[PDB]
């Protein structure tokens, strides 16, 4: 998994191979420019010390001594002139400089990126769809921006700041030996203790904002999958369990931050103590090298100031060879999608496009495994003809060959053995595409794409008219709704606008199937999931669109199949018998058993949230000040150094006046260390406790609230998981940073600014005028550093919306072949901000530049009105290293500071949106303790006129005076039309919802007086795709009663009568087999067993059965039947109801039409009512 | 190895200037104050004056002011002085003393040259 | 511009003893620092004049344990303890505390008392 360098730098034209070099010899000529400064640094202290000291030795010079002490001064007053002129030099030059390496590098890299991400979403288009169902789809997505934006970070702007830092180190290195290489090895001594420390101190500063919830991630996937099971887990209890089981997965996140906040201060304080040493050891050694006279003060600031940035140039350069490996890594599975290839070319313009097709279609003795499973055979030795107009239906066992036909005549796989043939040529010599779009599929699920109608149809023909769309909606029999609804054909459809139902999103799949006008028509399940009412429309809109087609079905409930032209039977992936209707009447095959079988902060309020765990922030508070002392403190004793070094004291008291002040720089270090040891462990520690506690009430609060508020579409899962696992971090910034950057930076500028007005008023002023723009040049300058300032990921998320959407409807866009209309849309969706990122690519490269040239213009204007002021003898030179130090490095230092902590927009937007949510008070309160709890276990449940509105769209009404009865023991089931209201019964009689009007009775008693927590626990609900918790099988059938005890031996009993005991005995590991993604993979039958078990537990004297079509299982068909015959057999049972087979023995059911009961009575009466019961029993008759 | 070595005795008649050199070798010539200092035959050592030697910033005694001009070069590390308008009462034993710069008045005048000697006739 | 009498003109030591140097300043060579700058020289003809003790007390760096200084205020004094017959030259005093002059002792010659 590495790319070379070379085959990296592949998608560079003739432009950005020059944009990259003019950019690395501007990074060159960049890096090179701090160290002379610090040599022009040298030269100008050795003038003001060598004038200080000559002007200091003869003040005993009466008479006349006006002008020899101002002449005195007139050397150094006319030399600064010129270092005024390099000082200005090395600021004009390395703002142009520093303005060309950094845009430079950020538009080679987007114009690199920009071809990269583009040919990337191609070669993803551009891919075979076996290739497809290997490679898990929602990772494929994930790559595709992630990884995008990983070679990205690593290509562009990091491999600037590497060339600039290691030019940083080579030239601090050769102007240190040039100088003095004495010192030069002394500090070289010590240099790779000093790299490594600003090795690991940058590494923690650079992200430092991604690597944070990695320990979260387990409690996150719990939370998670809670939250993505709601209608189970508060309908099951264990909201108390699965609150403990978050928080016992919390808990543990909670010590793994612990531990990344102090070991991140003790990377900062190994950092910081080994500055302040090597300050101590290179003032000490120095200072013992100049008072022997063999250095000058100017050489041992020189050679001591760029050695030492070199050597922590070196780790500022650590981090950029990771982030090239990184990328390198990342272009591996990119570079190597890009590359190659598909065998069936869908792009391809290469074989014959035989025009007038009639249909004549043919099979010849095919063979073929999906390559996801070679050694299962799905379709052995198969033959077919079906010739121009004719029907052709093929039924058999499901799973073998029904949806393969339909699926190798799209030519999705290649056959193994045998030949596809259409019109006596083979399919694989003609084009790909022209055999598309001479097909018109019609799938099981439709899909519509988040736009308008008429754009869902321009996705089936581009070049349509809007008089043809028309016609197209008129023939499906769509346009007479389609005018009803509110906006007109614009109404936008999708995941963000109205909700159409099933077979309104499948009679306009077939308005795109009829517009692109095939000859061929292949329908795969197109009525298998829709009910009785919709059906007749759909078979209506079918039939009018096979005139003239000739036509392949594969579908379940062959009502209308008889009219077809022929019937073929499969078993084994084989055919064994073909015909019309009658003939596979007479023959009592397989089709004979089927047709049988058929018939705003407030920042104090943040403050006092955190008001438990105060004694942590007092020792805070009176920490950070020390912090805060310590930044002048360095430059009062560095200002004392070289102030001692421009005076003409004693040899000895200058030998022990420095040693007192070496020895001080390391009581700094110690004293720093410790200081922001235990300021990060107390603020850490606080913040931490704080965000587990506060993630701790925000779920559960969010596990307390009903049903009504997950309904709210600002409340989907990725909101909720998101929201709490962002929104709890931040607020962490919200109250305990600020107070540590507000003091650390009122002790350090406040005493800054007091200290330097006690020195030297005028020069203070002066440099006043100053402190702001340097102080946004260390916000800006680490805001570069971090890789903050580049990347923003919110102007992408308009066109991450197209790349999710094609990669996950990826079946029905390649077949319709759009997948060049959804390159060119993605295309220009990341060519507008890729106009806006090559605006801000100059923007920053001439702030950056600009700041960076405010600090050596900075250097110059200070340091000229200083000689000013020391030249009529009303300061002295170290009042102007103090007050410049104290101004200009304070200044620095609160910039650093400012930026290094959170935010504090966010942070309060974050507070607000957290105590805006756990101070929130449910309507059905579940956690309630009050109701009246009796000991009745009949259960007569009664409906009395119920009125519901669903709250997330209250304006359709959906359930009017609902009323009906239900004895004790007997079975009631349910079905209906569309739109009726028969999946709400579930949901009102476990109290998702009260009611508005109208009143809901459980043993003569309404619910809404009996306590939640009971109602739910006399009910067994039983879901229609069972959901399985990630956990063995002791827990997930035992998740069903809680508040108990449950016993080993009590899961087996519920286990043999949902029929799994006998087949649980022969599966590996029988009981804590584990189940989920790593595990088994159970079947829906099986899984549909398991949650009839976990209903079984509780032995509920209610049982709800909420089951749906279809099961193709053919295996575990009639073992979920006789389990959920066994479990209703002494038990009031409500079933929702679609399989016809259940209802006969039903003691009564009920049809429900928009809220409306029609009649009611036995099956059979029903049935001799010739009203609806008779009718939906009619249509399987044919 | 540090060494002050000065040149040879010079013979010049009264009137013209004499330029006289103190090359210095083996320590870092761009601290020490050069000062040049006066011994007549049996007398106390006069002081003439110094030179800075990073910047050449002179200072003269109030005797010798004008009648003694001081140079530096530095390149090939030496101090001069043109000692220009010369009389009787100039011909003298010449030496070259260097003087810390980092503490000067407070430390003594450690290294010296060997002494020219300037006889000026008529 | 203390004017320095140093007190020896001509110093008569034989070989192998001691014989001490006086320097008597005009002017209190005490500076506001507790230290007296007074430096002590040795000359040869010929040669480069060496400097010998400095600080009246101190010693410098490469000189024998032969040369040893005392005194204090206005009186100040060096030891020639046990001399050879290697230390037979001109010894002078330097210096004023009190700037710019530097005004230099006299001088002090040796001999060998015949």
């Known amino acids: 998994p590495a790319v070379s360098v070379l085959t990296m730098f592949r998608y560079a034209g003739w432009l950005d191979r020059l944009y990259m070099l003019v950019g690395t010899l501007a990074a060159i000529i960049h890096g090179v420019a701090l160290p002379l400064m610090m040599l022009i640094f040298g030269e100008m202290t050795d003038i003001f010390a060598n004038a200080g000291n000559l002007e200091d030795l003869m003040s005993n010079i009466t008479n006349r001594s006006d002008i020899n002490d101002t002449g005195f001064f007139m050397n150094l007053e006319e030399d600064m002139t010129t270092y005024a002129y390099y000082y200005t030099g090395i600021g004009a030059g390395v703002l142009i400089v520093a303005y060309i390496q950094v845009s430079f590098w950020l538009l080679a890299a987007g114009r690199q990126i920009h071809k990269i991400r583009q040919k990337f979403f191609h070669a993803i288009m551009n891919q075979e769809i076996g290739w497809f169902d290997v490679h898990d789809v929602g990772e494929l997505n994930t790559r595709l921006t992630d990884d995008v934006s990983k070679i990205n970070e690593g290509i562009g702007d990091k491999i600037g700041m590497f060339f600039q830092a290691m030019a940083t180190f080579f030239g601090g290195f050769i102007i240190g030996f040039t100088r003095g290489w004495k010192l030069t090895l002394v500090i070289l001594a010590i240099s790779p203790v000093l790299g490594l420390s600003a090795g690991i101190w940058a590494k923690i500063l650079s992200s430092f904002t991604d690597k944070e919830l990695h320990a979260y991630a387990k409690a996150g996937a719990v939370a998670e999958e809670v939250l993505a099971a709601i209608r189970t887990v508060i309908a099951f209890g264990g909201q108390k369990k699965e609150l403990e089981r978050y928080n016992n997965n919390l808990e543990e996140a909670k010590r793994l931050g612990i531990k990344k906040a102090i070991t991140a201060n003790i990377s900062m304080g190994a950092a910081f103590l080994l500055i302040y040493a090597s300050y101590a050891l290179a003032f000490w050694y120095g200072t013992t090298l100049v008072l022997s006279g063999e250095y000058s003060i100017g050489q041992v600031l020189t050679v001591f100031f760029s050695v030492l940035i070199g050597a922590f140039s070196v780790g500022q350069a650590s981090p950029n060879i990771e982030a090239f490996a990184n990328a390198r890594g990342a272009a591996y599975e990119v570079f190597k999608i890009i590359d190659n290839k598909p065998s069936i070319d869908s792009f391809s313009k290469s074989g014959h496009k035989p025009d007038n097709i009639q249909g004549n279609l043919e099979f010849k003795n095919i063979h073929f495994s999906y390559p996801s499973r070679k050694e299962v055979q799905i379709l052995k030795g198969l033959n077919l003809k079906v010739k121009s107009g004719q029907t052709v239906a093929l039924v058999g066992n499901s799973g073998a060959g029904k949806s393969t036909t339909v699926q190798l005549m799209q030519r999705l796989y290649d056959p193994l053995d045998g030949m596809v043939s259409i019109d006596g040529q083979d399919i694989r010599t003609i084009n790909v595409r022209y055999l598309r779009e001479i097909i018109g599929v019609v799938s099981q699920e439709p899909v519509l794409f988040a736009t308008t109608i008429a754009e869902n149809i321009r996705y089936g023909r581009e070049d349509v008219t809007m008089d043809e769309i028309e016609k197209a909606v008129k023939e499906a029999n769509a346009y007479d709704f389609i005018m009803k609804l509110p906006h007109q054909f614009d109404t936008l459809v999708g995941e963000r606008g109205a909700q159409l139902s099933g077979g309104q999103k499948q009679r306009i799949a077939i308005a795109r199937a009829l517009v692109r006008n095939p000859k061929i028509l292949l329908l795969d399940e197109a009525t298998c999931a829709l009910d009785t009412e919709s059906e007749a429309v759909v078979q209506a809109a079918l039939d009018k669109a096979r005139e003239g087609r000739t036509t392949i079905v594969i579908a379940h409930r062959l009502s209308t199949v008889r009219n077809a032209d022929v019937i073929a039977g499969f078993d084994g992936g084989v055919i064994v018998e073909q015909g019309n209707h009658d003939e596979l009447m007479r023959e009592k095959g397989i089709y004979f058993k089927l047709v049988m079988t058929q018939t705003p902060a407030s920042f104090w309020r943040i403050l006092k949230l955190n008001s438990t765990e105060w004694p942590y922030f007092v020792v805070g508070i009176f920490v950070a000040i020390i912090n805060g002392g310590l930044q002048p403190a360095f430059s009062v004793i560095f200002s004392k150094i070289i102030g001692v070094f421009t005076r003409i004291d004693d040899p000895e008291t200058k030998r022990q006046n420095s040693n007192l002040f070496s020895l001080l720089f390391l009581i700094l270090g110690i004293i720093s260390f410790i200081t922001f040891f235990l300021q990060g462990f107390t603020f850490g520690k606080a913040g931490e406790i704080l965000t587990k506690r506060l993630r701790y009430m925000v779920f559960k609060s969010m596990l307390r609230q009903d049903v009504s508020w997950f309904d709210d579409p600002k409340n989907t899962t990725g909101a909720l998981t998101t929201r709490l696992a962002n929104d709890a971090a931040q607020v962490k910034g919200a109250t305990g940073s600020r107070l540590a950057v507000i003091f650390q930076n009122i002790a350090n500028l406040g005493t800054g600014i007091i200290i330097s007005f006690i020195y030297g008023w005028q020069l203070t002023l002066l440099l006043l005028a100053i402190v702001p723009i340097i102080a946004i040049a260390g916000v800006v300058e680490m805001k570069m550093l971090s890789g903050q300032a580049l990347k923003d990921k919110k102007e992408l998320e308009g066109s991450g919306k197209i790349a999710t959407e094609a990669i996950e409807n990826f079946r029905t866009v390649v077949s319709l072949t759009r997948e060049q209309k959804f390159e060119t849309m993605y295309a220009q969706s990341l060519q507008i901000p890729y106009r806006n990122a090559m605006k801000k690519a100059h923007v920053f490269g001439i702030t950056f530049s600009f700041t960076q040239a405010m600090m050596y213009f900075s250097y110059a204007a200070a340091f000229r009105f200083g000689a000013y002021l020391v030249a009529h003898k009303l300061m002295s030179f170290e009042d102007v290293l103090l007050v410049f130090s104290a101004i200009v490095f304070g200044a620095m230092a609160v910039g650093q500071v400012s930026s290094f902590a959170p935010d504090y927009a966010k942070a309060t937007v974050s507070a607000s949106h957290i105590i805006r949510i756990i101070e929130k008070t449910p309507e059905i309160d579940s956690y309630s303790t009050q109701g009246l709890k009796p000991n009745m276990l009949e259960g007569n449940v009664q409906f009395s006129g119920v009125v519901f509105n669903y709250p997330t769209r209250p304006s359709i009404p959906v359930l009017q005076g609902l009323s009906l009865e239900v004895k004790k023991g007997q079975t009631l089931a349910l079905v209906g039309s569309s739109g009726a209201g028969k999946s709400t019964v579930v949901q009102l009689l476990e109290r998702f919802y009260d009611p508005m009007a109208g009143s809901v009775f459980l043993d003569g008693k309404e619910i809404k007086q009996l306590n939640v927590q009971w109602l739910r626990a006399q009910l067994g609900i039983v879901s229609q795709e069972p959901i399985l918790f990630d956990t063995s099988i002791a827990e997930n059938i035992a998740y069903g009663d809680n508040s108990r005890v449950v016993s080993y031996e009590e899961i087996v009993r519920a286990a043999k009568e949902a029929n799994i005991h006998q087949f649980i005995d022969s599966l590996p590991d029988k009981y804590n087999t584990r189940v989920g993604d790593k595990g088994t993979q159970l079947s829906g039958g099986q899984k549909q067993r398991i949650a009839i078990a976990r209903a079984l537990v509780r032995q509920p004297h209610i049982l709800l059965l909420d089951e749906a079509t279809c099961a193709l299982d053919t295996e575990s068909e009639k073992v979920v039947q006789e389990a959920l015959d066994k479990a209703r057999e002494g038990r009031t049972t409500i079933v929702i109801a679609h399989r016809l087979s259940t209802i006969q023995n039903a003691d009564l059911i009920v049809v429900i039409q928009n809220g409306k009961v029609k009649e009611h009575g036995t099956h059979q009466q029903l049935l001799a009512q010739k009203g609806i019961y008779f009718s939906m029993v009619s249509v399987q008759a044919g | 190895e540090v060494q002050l070595q000065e040149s040879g005795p010079e013979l010049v008649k009264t009137g013209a200037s004499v330029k006289i050199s103190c090359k210095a070798s083996?320590?870092?010539?761009?601290?020490?104050?050069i000062h040049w200092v006066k011994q007549s035959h049996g007398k106390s050592l006069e002081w003439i004056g110094f030179?800075?030697?990073?910047?050449?910033?002179?200072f003269y005694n109030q005797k010798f002011k004008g009648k003694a001009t001081f140079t530096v070069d530095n390149s090939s590390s030496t101090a001069y002085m043109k000692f220009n308008s010369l009389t009787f009462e100039d011909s003298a034993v010449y030496y070259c003393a260097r003087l810390p710069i980092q503490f000067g008045n407070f430390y003594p005048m450690d290294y010296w040259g060997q002494g020219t000697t300037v006889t000026v006739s008529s | 511009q203390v004017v320095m009498t140093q007190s020896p003109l001509s110093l008569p030591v034989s070989l192998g003893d001691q014989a001490s140097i006086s320097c008597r300043s005009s002017?209190?060579?005490?500076?506001?620092?507790?230290?007296?700058?007074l430096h002590w020289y040795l000359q040869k003809p010929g040669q480069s004049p060496k400097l010998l003790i400095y600080k009246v007390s101190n010693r410098f760096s490469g000189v024998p344990d032969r040369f040893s200084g005392s005194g204090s205020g206005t009186d100040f004094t060096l030891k020639i303890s046990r001399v050879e017959a290697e230390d037979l030259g001109v010894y002078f005093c330097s210096q004023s505390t009190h700037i710019p002059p530097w005004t230099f002792g006299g001088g002090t010659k040796l001999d060998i008392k015949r």
């Open positions: 083996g320590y870092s010539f761009s601290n020490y104050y």
């Open positions: 030179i800075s030697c990073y910047n050449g910033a002179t």
């Open positions: 002017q209190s060579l005490l500076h506001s620092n507790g230290n007296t700058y």
